[PDB]
Amino acid sequence: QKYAMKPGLSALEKNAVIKAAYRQIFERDITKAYSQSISYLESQVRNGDISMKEFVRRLAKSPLYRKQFFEPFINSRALELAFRHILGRGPSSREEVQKYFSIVSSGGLPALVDALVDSQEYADYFGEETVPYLR
Ligand code: NA
Ligand code: NA
Ligand code: NA
């Protein structure tokens, strides 16, 4: 089951695409109703002013994402969570854990998100338009 945001999709499909995005990132049925920010963000991705990649990015940086999947955890644990939500897999090696560990110490949640989202792997699997999915 793969979902991709494109500007000319029907509203039914767009709704389905957005819903998948929240479920993959927040692991629950968040809605535009949750905050001004998320609603604004949703309007951006729905209208094509930002791509799906950019939507995932801003979503993963949000206070909701931060309080559920970053703030309560040690660097080590927060990065494996972000891996799963953004990349659809767990970290593959101790060398990869280390790479992202320093990024987290260095630039916290925003740097963790940017790095996962801007990796060549993310580009290969999900690109600009596709919701991350469990691999
Ligand atoms: Na914003
Ligand atoms: Na939020
Ligand atoms: Na940032």
Side-chain angles (χ1 to χ4, degrees), residues 21-32:
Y22 294 136
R23 183 158 44 248
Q24 167 75 197
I25 296 299
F26 301 115
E27 283 184 21
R28 267 170 180 82
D29 306 321
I30 303 312
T31 267
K32 64 191 284 183

Side-chain angles (χ1 to χ4, degrees), residues 35-89:
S35 72
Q36 170 182 198
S37 181
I38 287 176
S39 172
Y40 167 64
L41 289 184
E42 176 172 332
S43 78
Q44 279 289 278
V45 75
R46 173 180 300 273
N47 189 226
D49 300 298
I50 63 175
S51 62
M52 174 63 263
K53 184 153 88 78
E54 185 60 23
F55 188 51
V56 158
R57 180 187 239 128
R58 296 189 188 181
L59 290 181
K61 283 181 181 166
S62 71
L64 184 39
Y65 183 97
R66 177 180 293 267
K67 92 178 181 188
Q68 271 187 17
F69 303 113
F70 188 86
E71 182 57 21
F73 308 98
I74 62 189
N75 184 334
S76 230
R77 175 56 173 165
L79 74 86
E80 50 187 298
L81 286 171
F83 258 81
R84 305 198 117 93
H85 298 294
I86 299 165
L87 231 54
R89 69 164 173 92

